[model samples]
Target: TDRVSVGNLRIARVLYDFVNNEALPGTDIDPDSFWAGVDKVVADLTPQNQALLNARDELQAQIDKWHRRRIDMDAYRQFLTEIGYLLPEPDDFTITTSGVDAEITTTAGPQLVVPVLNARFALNAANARWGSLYDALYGTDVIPETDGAEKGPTYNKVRGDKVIAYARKFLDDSVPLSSGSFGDATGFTVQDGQLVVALPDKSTGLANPGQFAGYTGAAESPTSVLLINHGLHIEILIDPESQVGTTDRAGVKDVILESAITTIMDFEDSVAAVDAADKVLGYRNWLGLNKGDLAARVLNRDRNYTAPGGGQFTLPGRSLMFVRNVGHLMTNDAIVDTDGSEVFEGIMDALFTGLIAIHGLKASDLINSRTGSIYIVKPKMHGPAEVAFTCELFSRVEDVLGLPQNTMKIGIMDEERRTTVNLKACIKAAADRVVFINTGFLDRTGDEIHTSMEAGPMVRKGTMKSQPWILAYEDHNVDAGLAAGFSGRAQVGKGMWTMTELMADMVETKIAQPRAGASTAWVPSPTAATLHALHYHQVDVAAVQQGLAGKRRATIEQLLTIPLAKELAWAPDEIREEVDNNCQSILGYVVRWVDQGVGASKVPDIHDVALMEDRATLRISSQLLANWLRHGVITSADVRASLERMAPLVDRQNAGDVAYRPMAPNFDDSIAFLAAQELILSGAQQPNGYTEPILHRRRREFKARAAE
Candidate 1:
């Protein structure tokens, strides 16, 4: 590794050139000063980073030993206390995260996470502010696809009617007329700040007149009327000249919900960027977004379609956006040290992401934050110290960029055990600048298993969700956020809906997130965002939070409760099925990630059930396998046999994909296969059971070899 001087710092030529020429030149920042600041920040923070990582290792070792000694519940709980695995409770406090957008502060709606590496996806997510209710219903099983209403290539008029009927019923339920159902309403009008519905018998106003927010076009033939319910916005479109509108009494072609109120332009778990080139691609997209000039030409159906940056709409209003950066664990060769070692990728992300967001603050074309703040959701921080370190890092970056204090807001992910236990303390560390806090069930579960690896053989992954600790974790997060006065300030979010294709199940089940008082929950696509937005309309998250405020805070005891299987005496068939399922999932996701560089997609499981697979889901599956292996529920040989058996199944599942590289025929040469094997066999020693270190290393190596 040859060190090249760029400005004032000695950096890898690839990274040095990128920063000096590409990132800094037009930004009005002197190249020498920028590089000097980077050098100073890295030098000042590197030792602290090492210490934080060392602390994680030390704590894990102690917990592992404690778990090894006590197998029973009572004894294990006592052991945890003795070993300081559970910390003393901090005094009650509320978060004072100001400058938060309304979507985060007041509205409770669906949130989208799209890979920033794909500009089309990024554009789709950003523009997902408004989704056609008719399209969302007609396409999926949201409405029963019966009586010749099955969705096919061609649009079914019968199904379209069903969708329209369903949308009308939803309107009737949410924003109803004083006289009759929306189904009977012949026309909609906004007269003097009131919504008027005309029926056969009479013209009437809304039961609650205030539901009408605003209207577009003249009052006689309004193009659209905005209605608000539970802080979620819905637009009733009226265009009598349009095809669908011509046939209708109200001329309502579509009802667009303010969907995906906050979208996470993901670079961490949702991206497969492995090297310097990949990192640059991700960063550049983010920069484009901040500069308010992100555009992508996408081939849709028959022609090339171009999507420009999403701007504020006067008709129905706008949605807020948040950019999620990678965790602190993985290092990348995008910038190598003098000794040829990989540089910490998270450090690179913090600086670059903040720099890009500065453009948003300065831009006039698109406004991401009206309050002149940048929302960066930082995932996978360990504890209070790590959160504090992140705040410090952001502060230094702000100084380097000549920005105001607390301009960069942090969304702390309560995924790891340490952070989950001392969540309030963690928030307190960055409370002044904290804008969001969310729980990730998949990654949190993964960390749970890894942190308590030596305790016992865990319950099957499917059963882990029903465990006491899982419920407690969810409850605690909401309680803490509300207690910290995040009610009308920062967002208290829930996890993703893993089954992207199963809209029917989502419509039935995902309402529990907002009902449980989460302001936001993750949705896979723009359609999903639209559909999930209906949940916000149904439940008033603010009301739920108010009721929940009186409830007692969740104790550390409940959070520290290890979800060990009470009945580890599984039958032979059950054991084999679980192992096979885990192995199949691992292969299905790893193959695409390693071979094709597809970060986030729907992958078929062992039973051919399509589930959304990102690195978070990968973490849970791989860590589960590792836990089973450590506890003697499964062995190295068993894992090997299972992988070999599941490989062909995965290959068959992905047979339709043109770029897929099969692992069955040449498993020995398959880098992904080798990586998965190593993940399970050596899972116990992996840092916090994260898959990034090994995956990134192998991915970079494969890219290097392929370049030759």
Candidate 2:
């Protein structure tokens, strides 16, 4: 069974069996219907999709020429219109996406996007529904290790006390008392259907009675009390006999936050699904997850939260899942056309992933999507037309699978330059099916630089955030999302905080996202998800989004402004410093990606700070250095020197990992090392400044060598 001809498409041996034997068995749809629908989609949509990609290239070529001629705003704007690069914004609209779970539609909390290749990580992310505030606090930099508060092999009571103190203050701020702080509480009990924080002097009720939602065990002697703040659940676990509970005033053992309310099981940027084998691995993981028996264990594959009696009991897992399909750009050889040409991966993903979701939709227990909808987050789409293409693709997939209309919803990544500027139109195109819109700074900046590759030298990498365009871009995403009536209906998300270890910094800083009107923001880990969930409690995101409605505060013209530096001048050391940091980042990430097939990991920086690095981060680092090199801010020699200098540093940093392959000594012999070097030197020529083509090529090569 080398291959099978399914209508006009030729399915690979692995993929054909994967669909027929594994994915299509339980789904009550005719196999012929699936093939027929997909063949039509591929035949009809592939041409249109190629046209959309060509349009991107044509527009970039024109923009490049215009930028080289002069930085004329009027002319550039005029040129964009003439070429139909900037589409007209649609009138006011409301997203009609239905059947979406409340995690996406209503809950304001952290969303996890993990590589589906790692089933362990994916399961961990999926189970991040309820995270322990105690464990989350005790393990991280959030509770400062000062005096005797340092973490150790044994539980440090000083650190434990500090963690408890921090949690108490948090409870005070989030679910405050009518009379005094929770630190003054002697115990907690329910009186007249309200949580009473009992002080020695008096019993205190919650400041807001409505915050007292529900409880467990008996009312007079409850084991846990459930509270709500800003639509997120916070459970105060009470156990007087427990170690931590004995030390507490209220026998509060753990404060559990509803974390990673939504998780994106990624098949896009964060995964190295290069060929049939890789795609199958990713697809099977997704299938297993939606089937409600993904088979992973942290403590056990049972129960999301604790019961009333302080025992682990069976509860429905709370993390709603989303799948990030590959964008319109890449084609996969997993299935080829009748002419032996590769098929569009986006089309393939739409058909198969939707088919697999039938399992999820059918199940009522431990379900992935309770509302019978498939959440597909399509990344790196260009504009309204491309978004329309995706909507059309989803429509076909739904039709094939016998699913209801709008059963498959899209989460748009406003990371492309075209999509960034024309987000309103993009949303309008898929208004009824649009469930999410998010601003990803890393890929967006890559597209920005690539869109205006011939534009004068960019401001430094760090300074790009402060630029006119980026500031407007972030604001515009929220503004556009609000304008489209996505507040309580769908998610408006922010990008990930790359630093995984610095939970203290995350706890302090990530609150700005929800306050800026985002319903959800990306977090690097489940622990980070738990920490970031506090931000939702702190800021009423619904209220913030309500305030941001009616008025679209961001200007399109500001987003149109290129973030070009007036002067190409930089101190030599400054250039070297920037190059050094970026080069180390690229080599550091690429080595793992190509050699070990580790798509996403916590890669340490030059200063030994472990950052949650992925292709999105690598996209920016490579593109930034590419921009500098293209405009002679640095030379090939300087870049090569930086690569040479940083390879050993990256090598040393990964020394602790046994699976790591060293890139120094004989760096030229390393495919991973070469991929890194090439990503910088040839970054300007990469399609939309994407690193996928080169990285995929190198990763495939490495896999073949290892097999040999």
Candidate achieving the largest TM-score: 2
> What TM-score would candidate 1 get against the native?
0.94
User: How far out, in Å, is residue 377 in model 2?
Assistant: 0.5
Give the poorly placed runs of model 2, Cα more than 4 Å off: 298-316, 656-658
Worst 10 residues of 2 by lDDT: 299-308
lDDT of 2 by residue, 1-708 (tens): 477887878888898788888898888777778778778888888898899889888877777777677556777777788888887777787878778888888888899889988888988898898899999999998998887889889999889989999988999999988998988888777776667788989877889988876777777777888887888878888998899998887788989888888889899888887889899998898888877767665312434433333444454455888989899988888888878898989889998888887887776345677677788999998889899989988987787788888989999999988998889899999888889999988899888888887887888788887788988898999988888889778899999898989999999998989989999999878999999998988898888888887876678678898878777458877888889888888888899899888888777776678888888889889988889889888889998888999999888878888878898989999999999999988998988899999998999999999998
Instruction: Give the whole-model CA lDDT for all candidates, comma-separated.
Output: 0.80, 0.85
Model 1 C-alpha lDDT per residue in residues 1-708, reported as the tens digit of each score: 455754334466666666676677557888777777776777677778778888888888988776565435576667656766555667877676777677777877888988999988887887787788887888788888777988878877778778888888899889878878899888876565566789989989989887877777766667877788997778788888876777677788788887878889999998998876787788888777666577784211111111112122443123466888887777776666556666677777888887777666664345678788888999999888899999998899888878788888998898888888888888889989988789988899999999888877788889988888889999999988888888888888999888877898999999999999998888889999999999888998889999898576666668777887776468889989988988888888888888878888787776777898988788888888888888788778889999999998888888888877789878989998998888788877889988887787777767777788
| Model 1 residue pairs with clashes | 94-484, 95-484
- Write down the TM-score of every candidate: 0.94, 0.96
Compute the lDDT for candidate 1.
Answer: 0.80
How big is the positional error of residue 351 in model 2, measured in Å on the Cα after superposition? 1.0
Candidate 2 at residue 203, lDDT? 79
